[PDB]
Amino acid sequence: FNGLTVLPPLLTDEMIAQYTSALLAGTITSGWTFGAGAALQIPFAMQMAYRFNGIGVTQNVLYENQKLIANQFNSAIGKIQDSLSSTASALGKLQDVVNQNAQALNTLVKQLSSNFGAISSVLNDILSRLDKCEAEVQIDRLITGRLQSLQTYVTQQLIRAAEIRASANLAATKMSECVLGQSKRVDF
Amino acid sequence: CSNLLLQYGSFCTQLNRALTGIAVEQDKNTQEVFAQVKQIYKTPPIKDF
Amino acid sequence: AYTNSFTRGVYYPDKVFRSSVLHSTQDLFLPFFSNVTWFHAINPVLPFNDGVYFASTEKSNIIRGWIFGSLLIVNNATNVVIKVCEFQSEFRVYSFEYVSQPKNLREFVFKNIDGYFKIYSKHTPILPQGFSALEPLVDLPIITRFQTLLALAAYYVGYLQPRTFLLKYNENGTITDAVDCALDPLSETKCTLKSFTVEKGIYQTSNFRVQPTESIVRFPNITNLCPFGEVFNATRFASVYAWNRKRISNCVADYSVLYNSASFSTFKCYGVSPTKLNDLCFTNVYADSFVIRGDEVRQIAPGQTGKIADYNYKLPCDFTGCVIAWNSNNLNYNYLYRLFRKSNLKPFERDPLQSYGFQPGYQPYRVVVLSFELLHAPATVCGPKKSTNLVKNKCVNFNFNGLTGTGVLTESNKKFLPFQQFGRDIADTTDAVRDPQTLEILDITPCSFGGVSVITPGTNTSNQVAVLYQGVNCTEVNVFQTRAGCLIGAEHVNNSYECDIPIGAGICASYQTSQSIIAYTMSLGAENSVAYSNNSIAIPTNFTISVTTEILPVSMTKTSVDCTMYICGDSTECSNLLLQYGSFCTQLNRALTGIAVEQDKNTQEVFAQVKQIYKTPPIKDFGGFNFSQILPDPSKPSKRSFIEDLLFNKVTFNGLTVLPPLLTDEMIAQYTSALLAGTITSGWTFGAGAALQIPFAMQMAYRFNGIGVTQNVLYENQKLIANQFNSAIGKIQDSLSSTASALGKLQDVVNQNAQALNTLVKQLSSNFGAISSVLNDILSRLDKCEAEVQIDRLITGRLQSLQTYVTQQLIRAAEIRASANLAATKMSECVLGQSKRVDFCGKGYHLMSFPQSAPHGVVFLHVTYVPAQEKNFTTAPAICHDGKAHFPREGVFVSNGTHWFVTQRNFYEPQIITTDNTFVSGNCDVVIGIVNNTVYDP
Amino acid sequence: TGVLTESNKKFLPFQQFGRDIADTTDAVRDPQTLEILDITPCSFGGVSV
Amino acid sequence: LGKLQDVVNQNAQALNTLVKQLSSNFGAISSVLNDILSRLDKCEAEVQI
Ligand SMILES: C=CC1=C(C)/C(=C/c2[nH]c(/C=C3N=C(/C=C4\NC(=O)C(C)=C4C=C)C(C)=C\3CCC(=O)O)c(CCC(=O)O)c2C)NC1=O
Ligand SMILES: *[C@@H]1O[C@H](CO)[C@@H](O[C@@H]2O[C@H](CO)[C@@H](O)[C@H](O)[C@H]2NC(C)=O)[C@H](O)[C@H]1NC(C)=O
Ligand SMILES: *[C@@H]1O[C@H](CO)[C@@H](O[C@@H]2O[C@H](CO)[C@@H](O)[C@H](O)[C@H]2NC(C)=O)[C@H](O)[C@H]1NC(C)=O
Ligand SMILES: *[C@@H]1O[C@H](CO)[C@@H](O)[C@H](O)[C@H]1NC(C)=O
Ligand SMILES: *[C@@H]1O[C@H](CO)[C@@H](O)[C@H](O)[C@H]1NC(C)=O
Ligand SMILES: *[C@@H]1O[C@H](CO)[C@@H](O)[C@H](O)[C@H]1NC(C)=O
Ligand SMILES: *[C@@H]1O[C@H](CO)[C@@H](O)[C@H](O)[C@H]1NC(C)=O
Ligand SMILES: *[C@@H]1O[C@H](CO)[C@@H](O)[C@H](O)[C@H]1NC(C)=O
Ligand SMILES: *[C@@H]1O[C@H](CO)[C@@H](O)[C@H](O)[C@H]1NC(C)=O
Ligand SMILES: *[C@@H]1O[C@H](CO)[C@@H](O)[C@H](O)[C@H]1NC(C)=O
Ligand SMILES: *[C@@H]1O[C@H](CO)[C@@H](O)[C@H](O)[C@H]1NC(C)=O
Ligand SMILES: *[C@@H]1O[C@H](CO)[C@@H](O)[C@H](O)[C@H]1NC(C)=O
Ligand SMILES: *[C@@H]1O[C@H](CO)[C@@H](O)[C@H](O)[C@H]1NC(C)=O
Ligand SMILES: *[C@@H]1O[C@H](CO)[C@@H](O)[C@H](O)[C@H]1NC(C)=O
């Protein structure tokens, strides 16, 4: 409440979740076809055979190890829940993003408590203690430094937003290549 | 203090412009990542995969 | 009577010529569409509020009086007379004398500003709706009233008020249009954008604050007067060796009676002004009294050097207080004072001794100093101000014991321990307070504030607007509350469409049907349910060839800014002063030079991916594919393609220098022509070494084989594919010859660099606290030593503008470099080859791509394969023939109901299931879904 | 400082000087003879080796 | 190897510049803090510092 305003995101969390549900449904029911145009349905065990054929394993392997593969996948999915229901350290990349924006803001607000060489950090105190001509000097001293704090904050935010944009472009590329299709790129 | 701030020109039209650009870019980032699908597909009630 | 002022009463505000510019100025103007009083003469004694507009449509002109106040101006239709004296066919105006020289819509504007009576006028032949600027007239030297005399028709009178206007000057330099800024939200948007046209979108125009209703002065219930008589009228003052410190606390001090008293010679207040002293509350007061010589009265001040300052009484540098000295030559060898000390005294420290005499410069002076403590500890001593009754749940201007502030006071559940007087938060702001009169706790919440945004479609479509008050609850301002704030002027609709203008929190707005602005929740897309079954597949039977354009910035305008010019325009003195700041401006130049070099590197990386300059043959036989729209044509002077020209027409002296790019546009076009020729004539081979020629219809078959479609499809649908591609290429021209919005990614790059530069240049018009923004004016008005200060003030701020600009440019150049690296990767992977990466080289299965130069960018025409006509079939993972399972070698098994076929997966081409399109492994007892069918043996 | 040239700009006969986008004195009116002179800053530019 | 060498050089030039900025007055009487503290009293040295 100091001129700060946090705008809400255009896409609410429910609707991000709806997008992800749509992507999962398309991947499950149609494979990579829904990314190239109309969603063409296909049994899951078949697009899985396609995906094995795409890594150099012929498709009889899947049909002869169907139950084993399904059990392995189910166990892995179960292990993800155990990794995420006990340990909070896996989410750090996001948590830092929340923290960095907080620390940047708090600092900014705390810079309102600094004199910057003036008699006081409170503008109304200066205006109530001093005449116009003498208060002008101190208020200019405060402006020169509150403005500098804003410039510092905005430069930091621009750099951080560039980093976040790089990460978001990577995430979009992964969604396009890892979800909407399968990738031959190694360790991508 | 506003009258005194006017002596510094237009630092704070451009600061607002920068922050507004950042905010718009965030929505663009989310749009680019998640809105990669034309329609909203739904899984069938029966789950035989 | 009454009528409307249809955008009348606009005049040239100054004697400055401006042309082809939208200039914003704020002064006394007639508001647009205001109610202007009609009159019909038969006197009417009008007022002079701040300035009078005056329109008239007569020859008679019996408006023959201009009385003020005594100022009495008369304009008698032949000679102007002005008489300033105490005044009280016929001359019945009343019971310095200036004289000036001896069917129509006559317009006039009168105002009195700074002792200047300004008349502006426009005598135009025949309120008429329209626009007409008012040129000035005689400005007179010299008052709150007006008169028109009727010495024994239609005239309209407005009233100017302070308004901001956006005047539009044409090429001839005359005003053709204007915008009343504070009329409607749309005009505020026009002001913010500095334009007369607004595109569809949401624009942050201004900010909204809840103004305080009343001021609450709340001081404790104490009335005992402070004991100031007993330290001023005391009979004996202690000597300056041991200055007598008397504490004052817990009383009401009246400082005005001391200040207005004439007995005191000097009353010097440091850190406070004596007039404001009654408005303040101090935690503690110290009154230190002593007597000194008259010439040493200046030594009692912060930051002074002398025997008294260092050895007797030391004031701190940050001394908040007052010093009061009066000549007391009535009340002598009894004044001991230290003269020799082994060091300097600490501030407010009391301790070789000398005693100068006094025989009635050398005269005695009795002095006291009132050291105040404006801490945030509990206030004890205060002024005589009354304590108003408090109010709650309302934005007020509160003042608790000198703690001023603005906000709503509410009852608090916070439990204060009974020694705590106020509260704080993480921000170290006053979250709560304790009322001195009644010992209760009040929470302080700053009353509502927030930005206000204007939802508008393009002004081409309509002038309707909605207004979003961001993050407020507009019970505190049809009307519809949202999670992003609240929206007025737009109606809520339960339907859901695609987003047109984003509001936030899932809410979008659009101009739709009478037509109005509607608000709704965005619909994420058409609802579709995939008919998934564990034995059904959907095979395409046809396809489409789709050409989609991807626009990528590559570079931006190379620029270089000489600091010594921008900061110190051909000034030696300012250059010498700039040298004191070191080497800021060798490194700023280095940074900008690095950016400029990086731009050329970006273009080199993107376009110079080809060893040689390939040329297409004169004969164009590419299997029916028509590349005339993208290949260069020699008829044009610049060897550019048709699409390249369409793209090149859709994009639009202060130490600044714009360097030219190393690669001219013609040569970028030559690079792109070479890439197109190589792609057409040789395929992907020219990127891997020597260009190996191949018929186009064949490398196209290769590219189909690379997306999982066998090559007979192409040869059997050659003409259809060629026609589809040609039609798509034709549609690109229609998309680019009418709509300019497709090129936005480049246009912004051009705009951002422009706005950054203009701002920079405009920062040269700012004082930054100095007397003037013009360096030569300061150097011509002031001496060297005094001009040095102001010039340093200007440098500190012009240098800051440069640093801001260069930081912005570095960040933007990083973004542009990222985009250029992406464009180079696309050229390498989409053009020099075909990419298996999904949605990288366009949507669909990538076939190829075409580069086209664009201003500071590149355009990739991605030709992709999109399957078109799906058909349901029943399928099976395998087939049991003779107890052994057969799997498809390449493809999938399908059935039209009766027979079983094997077909490729991206195009329905059924074939008889034989032993060469299938392979056998295992027995038919482990595969789930295997079916029984015969497998033919060749 | 600059070069003074004859101007085709038409000043209305109350306008004493002119400006540009940069809010710099693009033109001027000569007090002695009532004529209009365009102001152009005389040539400057970096030198490279 | 230039792409690496520049990285070594850019970090060096940035640092040297920084250190050299300690030799500038910035309008003060001297660039050496102890000189100001030894030449001036507390209140007057406060301004220059
Ligand atoms: C009273 C003081 C007075 C004022 C302020 C005034 C303003 C004024 N009137 C003008 C035109 C003119 N002004 C008038 C007459 C009048 N216009 C009036 O405001 C009034 C009150 C009359 C008298 C009844 C006429 C007839 C013209 C010429 C219009 C034409 O071409 O027919 C002009 C343009 C002169 C030029 O450059 O050609 C000015 C500046 N004239 C005056 O006499
Ligand atoms: C595949 O689609 C194309 C069009 O996308 C079809 O070609 C059209 O055929 C009709 C007649 O059936 C003509 O009137 C159109 O002019 C054709 N269009 C083009 C662009 O040539 C084609 O017939 C479809 N193939 C199948 C097997 O249905
Ligand atoms: C490739 O397309 C262009 C148009 O995009 C064709 O040029 C047209 O040719 C016809 C004659 O067949 C003329 O009547 C038109 O005026 C031409 N239009 C333009 C814009 O030049 C060109 O003929 C096509 N190429 C082939 C080989 O058919
Ligand atoms: C005169 O102006 C006032 C203020 O806008 C308006 O309320 C009133 O209706 C107007 N009168 C007429 C006759 O239009
Ligand atoms: C005004 O501008 C137009 C532009 O077409 C020009 O022709 C004309 O000479 C100018 N002057 C006048 C008085 O119209
Ligand atoms: C006088 O002071 C007491 C002390 O708390 C307070 O309760 C009372 O309201 C005060 N009187 C007035 C008139 O303010
Ligand atoms: C001191 O006494 C004189 C006369 O007795 C009086 O006029 C003056 O107001 C007194 N000053 C103070 C501070 O009491
Ligand atoms: C807005 O005000 C209403 C009425 O005072 C209240 O019920 C609501 O909780 C407030 N906050 C909102 C709508 O977020
Ligand atoms: C929209 O839905 C809300 C749901 O509560 C309902 O109250 C309202 O009447 C609906 N409006 C229309 C126009 O259907
Ligand atoms: C396939 O069958 C489903 C349900 O039987 C139907 O919804 C879908 O439209 C069919 N596909 C085609 C191409 O007709
Ligand atoms: C399936 O295809 C075969 C061969 O083309 C044909 O003889 C048969 O009639 C078809 N059956 C159906 C139901 O389409
Ligand atoms: C799944 O396939 C098996 C055999 O292929 C079939 O018996 C079963 O009915 C199918 N699932 C459903 C839900 O029909
Ligand atoms: C397939 O053939 C085998 C052996 O001929 C038989 O045991 C089995 O029941 C058959 N299944 C179907 C679905 O016809
Ligand atoms: C005197 O003033 C007039 C007014 O314009 C001007 O024309 C003339 O040149 C001036 N005389 C001299 C000697 O400058």
Numbering used by the authors:
A (entry chain C): 855 to 1042
B (entry chain C): 749 to 797
C (entry chain A): 27 to 68, 81 to 107, 116 to 134, 155 to 161, 168 to 174, 187 to 210, 216 to 231, 235 to 244, ...
D (entry chain B): 549 to 597
E (entry chain B): 945 to 993
Give me lines lifted from the publication on this model.
The spike (S) protein of coronaviruses is responsible for interaction with cellular receptors and fusion with the target cell membrane. The S protein of SARS-CoV-2 is a large, 1273 residue, type I fusion protein, that can be processed by host proteases into two parts, S1 and S2. The spike (S) protein of SARS-CoV-2 has been observed in three distinct pre-fusion conformations: locked, closed and open. To overcome this challenge, based on the locked SARS-CoV-2 S-R/PP structure, we engineered cysteines residues replacing positions D427 and V987 to generate a new disulfide-stabilized S protein S-R/x3.
We additionally introduced a D614G substitution into the S-R/x3 spike to obtain S-R/x3/D614G. Therefore, we determined the structure of the S-R/x3/D614G spike. The proportion of locked conformations is greatly reduced compared to S-R/x3, constituting only ~19% of total particles. Despite the presence of the x3 disulfide bond, 81% of the particles are in a closed conformation. The closed conformation accommodates the disulfide bond by motion of the RBD towards S2. Superposition of locked and closed structures indicates that the loss of interactions at the domain C/D junction leaves the junction unrestrained, allowing domain C and the RBD to move relative to domain D and the NTD and allowing the spike to open.
